[PDB]
Design a protein around this nucleic acid. Sequence first.
RNA 1: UACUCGAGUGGCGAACGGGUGAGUAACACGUGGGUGAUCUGCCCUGCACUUUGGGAUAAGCCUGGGAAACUGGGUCUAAUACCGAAUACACCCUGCUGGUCGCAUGGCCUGGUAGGGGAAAGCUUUUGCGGUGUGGGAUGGGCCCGCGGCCUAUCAGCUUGUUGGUGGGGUGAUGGCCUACCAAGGCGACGACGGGUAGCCGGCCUGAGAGGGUGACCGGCCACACUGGGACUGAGAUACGGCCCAGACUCC
Lengths: 94, 85, 200, 113
Amino acid sequence: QKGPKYTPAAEKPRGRRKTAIGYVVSDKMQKTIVVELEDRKSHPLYGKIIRTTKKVKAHDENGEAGIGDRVSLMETRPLSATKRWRLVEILEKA
Amino acid sequence: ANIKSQIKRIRTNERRRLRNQSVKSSLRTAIRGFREAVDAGDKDKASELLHATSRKLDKAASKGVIHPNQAANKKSALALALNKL
Amino acid sequence: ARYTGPATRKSRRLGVDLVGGDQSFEKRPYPPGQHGRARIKESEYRQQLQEKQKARFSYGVMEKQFRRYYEEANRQPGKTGDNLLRILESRLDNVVYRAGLARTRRMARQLVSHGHFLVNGVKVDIPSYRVSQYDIIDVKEKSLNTLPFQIARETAGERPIPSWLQVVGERQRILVHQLPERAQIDVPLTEQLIVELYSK
Amino acid sequence: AVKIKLTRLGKIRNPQYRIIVADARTRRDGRAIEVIGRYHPKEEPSLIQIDSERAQYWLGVGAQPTEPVLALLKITGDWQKFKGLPGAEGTLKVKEPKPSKLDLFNAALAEAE
RNA sequence: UACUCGAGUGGCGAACGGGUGAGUAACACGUGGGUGAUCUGCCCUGCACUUUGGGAUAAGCCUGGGAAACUGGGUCUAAUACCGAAUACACCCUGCUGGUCGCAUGGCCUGGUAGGGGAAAGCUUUUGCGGUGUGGGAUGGGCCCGCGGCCUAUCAGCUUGUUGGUGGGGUGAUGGCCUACCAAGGCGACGACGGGUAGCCGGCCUGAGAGGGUGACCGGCCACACUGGGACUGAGAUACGGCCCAGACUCC
Ligand SMILES: [Mg+2]
Ligand SMILES: [Mg+2]
Ligand SMILES: [Mg+2]
Ligand SMILES: [Mg+2]
Ligand SMILES: [Mg+2]
Ligand SMILES: [Mg+2]
Ligand SMILES: [Mg+2]
Ligand SMILES: [Mg+2]
Ligand SMILES: [Mg+2]
Ligand SMILES: [Mg+2]
Ligand SMILES: [Mg+2]
Ligand SMILES: [Mg+2]
Ligand SMILES: [Mg+2]
Ligand SMILES: [Mg+2]
Ligand SMILES: [Mg+2]
Ligand SMILES: [Mg+2]
Ligand SMILES: [Mg+2]
Ligand SMILES: [Mg+2]
Ligand SMILES: [Mg+2]
Ligand SMILES: [Mg+2]
Ligand SMILES: [Mg+2]
Ligand SMILES: [Mg+2]
Ligand SMILES: [Mg+2]
Ligand SMILES: [Mg+2]
Ligand SMILES: [Mg+2]
Ligand SMILES: [Mg+2]
Ligand SMILES: [Mg+2]
Ligand SMILES: [Mg+2]
Ligand SMILES: [Mg+2]
Ligand SMILES: [Mg+2]
Ligand SMILES: [Mg+2]
Ligand SMILES: [Mg+2]
Ligand SMILES: [Mg+2]
Ligand SMILES: [Mg+2]
Ligand SMILES: [Mg+2]
Ligand SMILES: [Mg+2]
Ligand SMILES: [Mg+2]
Ligand SMILES: [Mg+2]
Ligand SMILES: [Mg+2]
Ligand SMILES: [Mg+2]
Ligand SMILES: [Mg+2]
Ligand SMILES: [Mg+2]
């Protein structure tokens, strides 16, 4: 009774990652950009709808995004402190 | 240092730590030997020096002085260095 | 800790007979003491207090016992008054008294406490023993040959045994089958007032 | 180094024991991965209950049960089932069924009448 | 004689177990994921094996300080202790060369090809344990992320490795993590930087409910060992009965 030298493991499916879409408001830096993300929640006590915005640091390699443009974004592994967001594709420009 | 067990463990720790320091000194000597070889910019001397360095690092990983992944990454660094320069 | 003082004094003070064989109560129905004839202002608090005192001191139960009886009845899915009266009647002392083997609650309680009876073939001595539906109560020979027990069993001409209770033979075996209903218990006094007060 | 442990639950005068698979560095009463069986010393039947499938799976994946757990495995039949030498035999003794209250009442009523 | 074993070399255990809440307004905790960027003795299960040569020392003996712990000098000894060489192409690197995926680099197909290198210890004769490199389990872990959870403008601007990028170093790991060169920025009234309080959660109390207080025991994490710094060990370190240094106290 001789067994094979290779024993394949279980193919763990690759997991999903958070995806978001927002607007770029400044690109003065090099291959980095600002995108604002908007969220809506109900106040736990009063129930009011409250609008909030976030500032996130995205990753780029060519600086193809102009000011005041809608863009799609994605999650990546870390590259710089407080910079943990990545570009996928641009959607709207003006 | 209160009971025989820990005093003996102490003794052994200092002894084999002297041994550890000797070996680490040897590895660090190989490392900076490669460093100044690269700084000077030798090619065949660097070739045999890095052969010896890789041998020493592999043996250190084998006897547990350094992590085998650490040795592999160090060797890859040497290769990248010699190919860029 | 049982009650040692007089049993007639509570009946005299609260204005209604308890044992039923109390000659002094009918002799002097007015409240005892030096000024029992004086008028007393009527009040709901007074009324509720009299009802609860009547119940607790007539059944000889202890105060915390009655309190968690009430809490259990309230937690019971059924109506609180019915649950309370049923669990209160479930006490073994009252069970034997209504079975007719006992002439007084005090003596019945002492007999149960000393444990002259057998429960499912095992001797149990607890005056506040819980008795549930479809149970069996036996009698020991040391009780059968006991003189007062013989007197009770040969002179059991008291009020008729209730529906849920019934004796089968000379051994004085007591059985319970179904859950008493307030109407067929027909206990004196009322329970709505007591439950209201304990809700207060 | 997962080993099956007995967790002390219950009461002092009659201890109650569960059968648990957990790491050797966890507590006697703390972290657990699964609950698989139990032990009752007070009842002279000595009631034994265990999940055969889970026990077999753990023995296969490589648990190292202690001496008392191994003894319980022999008693139930799991250890010898795994080893395959004698086979599968059940040495456990079930608690004596309690005679029905209804038939006790019927017999008592018949005796009375 | 090894049945037995003082002390001494040599393995394993010794970060387990057990206590506490000063420090923290923080990924620290729960919650749900990512790790194509990660490691992992002792267990189980497979693959190929497990050659050779040598020096040294404790111990023991002689001896000096000295009540003391401990310590200097001379002689001397074995091991699975230490060190060369025998291969290894399932391992790690560099140059050339195909298919899929997208998560962007690039990953995977153990893709293919040229060159380089990578180690072992025996005892026992009994329900046997060990030594090297590689594939898979299970636990053990490491980094990161969206949401949540005190008061306070009688605290209005803060920061210079601070922000973004290029070459090197580094660790196991991606990374201003560090260094050298470039650009001047990032966060800010949707409350930064400041000041006061406090370990967190499953729970407990109260309350129909929303809501309010609280963290007893038990259960899961975070941090600490007179105070403040530093480093080696190891697969694993805030290393509470491990080590070096600075201060207060106590004892011979
Ligand atoms: Mg960088
Ligand atoms: Mg130096
Ligand atoms: Mg060698
Ligand atoms: Mg038992
Ligand atoms: Mg010895
Ligand atoms: Mg051993
Ligand atoms: Mg610890
Ligand atoms: Mg350890
Ligand atoms: Mg603890
Ligand atoms: Mg305390
Ligand atoms: Mg505190
Ligand atoms: Mg401190
Ligand atoms: Mg603060
Ligand atoms: Mg967390
Ligand atoms: Mg946490
Ligand atoms: Mg010596
Ligand atoms: Mg020798
Ligand atoms: Mg060796
Ligand atoms: Mg391949
Ligand atoms: Mg090679
Ligand atoms: Mg070789
Ligand atoms: Mg060898
Ligand atoms: Mg394997
Ligand atoms: Mg593995
Ligand atoms: Mg995890
Ligand atoms: Mg997160
Ligand atoms: Mg939160
Ligand atoms: Mg900075
Ligand atoms: Mg600078
Ligand atoms: Mg590095
Ligand atoms: Mg930098
Ligand atoms: Mg409640
Ligand atoms: Mg609440
Ligand atoms: Mg609180
Ligand atoms: Mg607490
Ligand atoms: Mg706790
Ligand atoms: Mg400390
Ligand atoms: Mg102190
Ligand atoms: Mg301190
Ligand atoms: Mg280490
Ligand atoms: Mg370890
Ligand atoms: Mg320790």
